[PDB]
Structure 1
Amino acid sequence: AIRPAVKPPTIRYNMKVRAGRGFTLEELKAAGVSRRVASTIGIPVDHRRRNRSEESLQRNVERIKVYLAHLIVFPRKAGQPKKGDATDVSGAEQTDVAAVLPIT
């Protein structure tokens, strides 16, 4: 699953960036993703983490937007596309999220 980018705590590691557990409620809100829908399309939700700065919020909102733009949601009923789905599901394959959204 796609993971957020977070800064590690303490002065020894706060210069680095690493994968976190899940996206905050504010981050999902600002990217236009309901928290109940997030899990259904592989977006983890971390209710504990918060955004103390705009930089953390914007960085992870950008990760979600890139994920959504590369995401192909199949319709619940095959051959009857609905809102939020895709109509070109033919070229769907298992791809690495790190190939599309690496931690930089």
Structure 2
Amino acid sequence: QRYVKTWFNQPGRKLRRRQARQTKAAKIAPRPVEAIRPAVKPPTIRYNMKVRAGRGFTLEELKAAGVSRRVASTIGIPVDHRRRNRSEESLQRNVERIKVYLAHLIVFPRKAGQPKKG
């Protein structure tokens, strides 16, 4: 029962993180605070009946959904080069996760580079 961890900074850690959320999105307004995560099945027998947020959409999920790896991280769609679709169920649950995302997305135009000649 030596050195103790005492949580008197729990209420101030609650606000420190709230202000960090406030500081972050204020820097990147139009875009959401967080990325979209996929929906994945937990890897056990106690938990395979539930759905939970994944780490990102695999290469094939984005390929069928219509975004390539390079343009999918710009618009905020994390990729997961580890995860892979072993069954058509997970493919369809996450392909139509990006479908609703790409419908609700307003990609603002950037600045182009136009050389004087061709």
The unaligned stretches of length 5 or more in structure 1 are 79-104
The C-alpha deviation readout for 1:37-84, integer Å capped at 9, x for no partner, is 100000000000000000100000000010000000000029xxxxxx
Structure 2: unaligned runs, 5 residues or longer: 1-34, 113-118
Aligned counterparts of 2:36 and 2:77: Cα–Cα separation in 1: 6
Paired AA for residue 56 in structure 2? G
Percent identity of paired positions between Structure 1 and Structure 2: 100
Is structure 2 residue 89 aligned with structure 1 residue 55? yes
Distance, in Å, in 1 between the alignment partners of 2:44 and 2:94 is 21
Letter in 1 for 2:82: R
Aligned-pair RMSD on alpha carbons?
1.1
Count of residue pairs brought into register by the alignment: 78
Q: Does 1:23 align with 2:62?
A: no
The correspondence of residues 4-19 of structure 1 with structure 2, limited to 5 A, is: 4-19=38-53
- The DSSP-based 3-state class of the residue aligned with 1:28 is helix
Regions of 4+ moved over 4 Å: none
Q: TM-score, normalised by structure 1?
A: 0.73
Q: Which has the larger radius of gyration?
A: 2
